[PDB]
Amino acid sequence: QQEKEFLESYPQNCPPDALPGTPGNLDSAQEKALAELRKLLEDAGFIERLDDSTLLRFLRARKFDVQLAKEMFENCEKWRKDYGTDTILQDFHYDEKPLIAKFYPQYYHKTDKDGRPVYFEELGAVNLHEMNKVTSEERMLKNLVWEYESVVQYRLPACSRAAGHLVETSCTIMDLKGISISSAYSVMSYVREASYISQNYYPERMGKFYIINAPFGFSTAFRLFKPFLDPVTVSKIFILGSSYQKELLKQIPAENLPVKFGGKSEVDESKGGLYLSDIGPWRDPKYIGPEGEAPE
């Protein structure tokens, strides 16, 4: 069973100081929840994505409500049916990316100090007017599921191997330099769909969320509203302004942080520059496993 060979390719435990209910750090309750949830799903169909990390994430999202989680899994597998996201890496081909990378820079670059894939999103620079000249919202969404599936089947295992421990989550950094009320309305549609996909079909994959170059007001307002969000989803959220450099450098090494954000990592501009790169442990022989290297 080669599927089995794949979960032994990389470290299976989250670090011991990781949040509760994460692989390797389970109390008895959590263990029993997992065993008898896996039962319900295995009962009558469901033979893949029944691994511990997958299920413990769903549960961690529905606060351990085996019943509710059984459904998130069911709705997820139902969406995978329809969207065709198994085999999405085969079918979909985002050929327009070199044309439109500049009008919505999204790119993964290296790892954080805990091994997470770092995900840079310069939403502030967005230009949907130009972007729609060559592509659609539904394609943009497909691409995100492509980058997500690529995160799940390639980036995370190699990050696990390079970090010495399971890595389940990513470190997102959003540059709002250039954002406007105007831009915010034009991306509203897309961000709503992307979030729905993220939260309900990729539970617990957000490990850190940095907003940088946020307007001066916004950062202040969030510190007072903080009590509304869960205390856990506040340890991940960070909201910064003009001077973001070395607050980033506290969670990402200067060797892994791109130069434009203060670090010293750099990419060869002749081969498409930062916006078209995909450097990381998942492109490193030391850490690519029995799954092969990821597509492009």
Ligand SMILES: O=C(NCc1ccc(N2CCCC2)cc1)c1ccc(F)cc1
């Ligand atoms: O980072 C993840 N979720 C958090 C997130 C979701 C959406 C967005 N935006 C989309 C448009 C605006 C910002 C930013 C972060 C994640 C989700 C699934 C994965 F497999 C890996 C990582």
